[PDB]
Amino acid sequence: LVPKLTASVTDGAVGVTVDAPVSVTAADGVLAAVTMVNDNGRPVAGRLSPDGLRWSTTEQLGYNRRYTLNATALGLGGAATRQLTFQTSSPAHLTMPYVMPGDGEVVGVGEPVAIRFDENIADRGAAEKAIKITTNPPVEGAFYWLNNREVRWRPEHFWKPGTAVDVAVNTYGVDLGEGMFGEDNVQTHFTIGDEVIATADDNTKILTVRVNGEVVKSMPTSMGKDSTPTANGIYIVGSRYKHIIMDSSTYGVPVNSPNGYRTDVDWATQISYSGVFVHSAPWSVGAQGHTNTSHGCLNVSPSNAQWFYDHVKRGDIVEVVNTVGGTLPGIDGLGDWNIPWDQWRAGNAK
């Protein structure tokens, strides 16, 4: 018999996707020579298996390239040589994904997996299919989009402490719609730590912190006054700051207006994208535990705010109850758990 060559691409193909390697296989013989080059003549790196049967590229292949593959197979019964030229995808736009939380981080039981693209995603389904989430112990979860750029993945309930979470965003070479392709792959891995849930009850004006179900801190607080109340519901802890100037314009409200403010504060823990923080409030210690005076923030004492900074971490939970406000929006940024599971699981890929 005469050796047979089989490649993963066909001569004259166009729109060849660069999400996978290019390969060539010999049957009834072995591969004696395999080379691939770009349109400038520069060689593409590859590897031939020890048995001589299978060659594959080993580096990232480029968008908008014309590659030429030359292969020869030799066997007892003869020789075959093939030359194949093909063109890879040519994107209209590129989008880079950014994943949170950080690689190697230990996070609380409320932390969703977040993939944020730097451009609007036309094909949300293609984006979801390209994101591989591994959990150990395994748990069911699902994707939901907060806006046109950001998608989240979480389970039905808060995570179990000790769970490993691996996130592979395999978007390089993937058409995310209207010719927007992934700029690159991204990968993160995190772990869930202890269960920490802090409850602010407007009936008592106390912020109680529980760690694995035990009360460890009871903080008198002053939440949003009646005209600018703090919303009820489940908030995920985000960033923390030793000090920060809180600027209402950051959150939609001009400083100079009736509910605007610009205020330098210490020991600030962010709990909503709408600009709710737990923070130090020396001016309101008299009202804390008694009356609501703020713009929405959970005002506590300097030592309590510092304690919160030190002992609460990204992905821990604050639950507000019994205020005169509404409910925090599910799509706030840190309001994900306010979306009922049936609705979340259904998704919004479109």
Side-chain angles (χ1 to χ4, degrees):
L1 299 96
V2 44
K4 322 289 189 308
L5 287 165
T6 297
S8 71
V9 287
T10 68
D11 190 32
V14 124
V16 175
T17 60
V18 90
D19 59 342
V22 171
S23 67
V24 187
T25 302
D28 301 314
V30 303
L31 297 167
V34 179
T35 58
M36 191 162 114
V37 298
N38 63 35
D39 43 84
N40 297 325
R42 169 202 344 150
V44 178
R47 174 195 171 277
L48 180 53
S49 56
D51 65 11
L53 299 186
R54 297 168 308 283
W55 180 90
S56 177
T57 56
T58 53
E59 65 183 322
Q60 177 179 272
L61 303 176
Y63 289 126
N64 203 38
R65 296 317 239 130
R66 173 179 237 235
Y67 291 107
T68 295
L69 182 63
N70 284 282
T72 290
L74 304 175
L76 262 183
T81 295
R82 290 303 177 265
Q83 181 176 275
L84 298 85
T85 296
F86 65 92
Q87 306 207 310
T88 61
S89 309
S90 190
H93 282 283
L94 299 179
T95 184
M96 184 71 205
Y98 297 86
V99 185
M100 283 295 282
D103 187 47
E105 294 290 298
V106 173
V107 298
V109 300
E111 187 72 348
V113 174
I115 304 97
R116 175 180 68 79
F117 294 95
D118 65 9
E119 301 294 332
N120 291 346
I121 302 303
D123 187 347
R124 300 178 174 180
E128 297 181 15
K129 193 187 314 142
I131 301 165
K132 185 171 173 55
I133 313 290
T134 304
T135 54
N136 184 12
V139 72
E140 184 192 1
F143 290 102
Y144 196 89
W145 293 71
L146 272 31
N147 55 54
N148 291 328
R149 301 186 175 192
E150 190 163 345
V151 69
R152 299 287 177 92
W153 191 107
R154 59 171 180 89
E156 182 174 359
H157 290 295
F158 298 155
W159 296 101
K160 294 289 160 191
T163 300
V165 188
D166 196 77
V167 183
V169 186
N170 294 331
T171 36
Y172 189 68
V174 177
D175 182 349
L176 298 173
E178 300 174 353
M180 191 183 274
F181 284 76
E183 187 165 338
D184 204 2
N185 300 319
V186 299
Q187 165 82 58
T188 192
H189 187 102
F190 63 97
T191 312
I192 312 302
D194 283 330
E195 181 207 63
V196 179
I197 301 171
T199 298
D201 189 343
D202 197 39
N203 291 339
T204 62
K205 313 274 193 288
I206 306 296
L207 178 58
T208 305
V209 182
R210 294 178 172 83
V211 176
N212 301 312
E214 306 175 340
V215 178
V216 301
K217 209 72 182 62
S218 305
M219 304 179 174
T221 190
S222 179
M223 303 195 278
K225 68 196 180 289
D226 298 355
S227 64
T228 61
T230 303
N232 296 301
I234 300 171
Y235 294 71
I236 299 167
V237 171
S239 299
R240 60 205 37 67
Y241 306 88
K242 297 212 168 93
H243 57 90
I244 189 174
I245 300 173
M246 290 187 321
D247 184 338
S248 62
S249 22
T250 308
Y251 315 106
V253 182
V255 176
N256 291 339
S257 77
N259 296 324
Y261 55 82
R262 189 162 42 223
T263 313
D264 189 1
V265 297
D266 294 315
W267 302 123
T269 296
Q270 189 156 9
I271 66 172
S272 73
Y273 287 26
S274 61
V276 183
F277 292 80
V278 181
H279 69 77
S280 178
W283 60 86
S284 62
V285 301
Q288 291 160 24
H290 305 294
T291 71
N292 290 335
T293 58
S294 80
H295 291 87
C297 288
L298 273 62
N299 281 12
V300 301
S301 72
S303 72
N304 278 324
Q306 186 174 1
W307 192 94
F308 206 92
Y309 178 103
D310 284 337
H311 295 257
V312 184
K313 69 185 118 60
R314 175 181 272 98
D316 289 343
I317 295 293
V318 175
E319 301 187 347
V320 183
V321 285
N322 300 318
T323 76
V324 304
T327 294
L328 184 67
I331 62 176
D332 167 83
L334 293 163
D336 313 35
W337 299 96
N338 297 300
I339 299 178
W341 174 239
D342 193 41
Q343 175 175 14
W344 187 277
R345 180 165 97 163
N348 64 349
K350 278 271 178 54

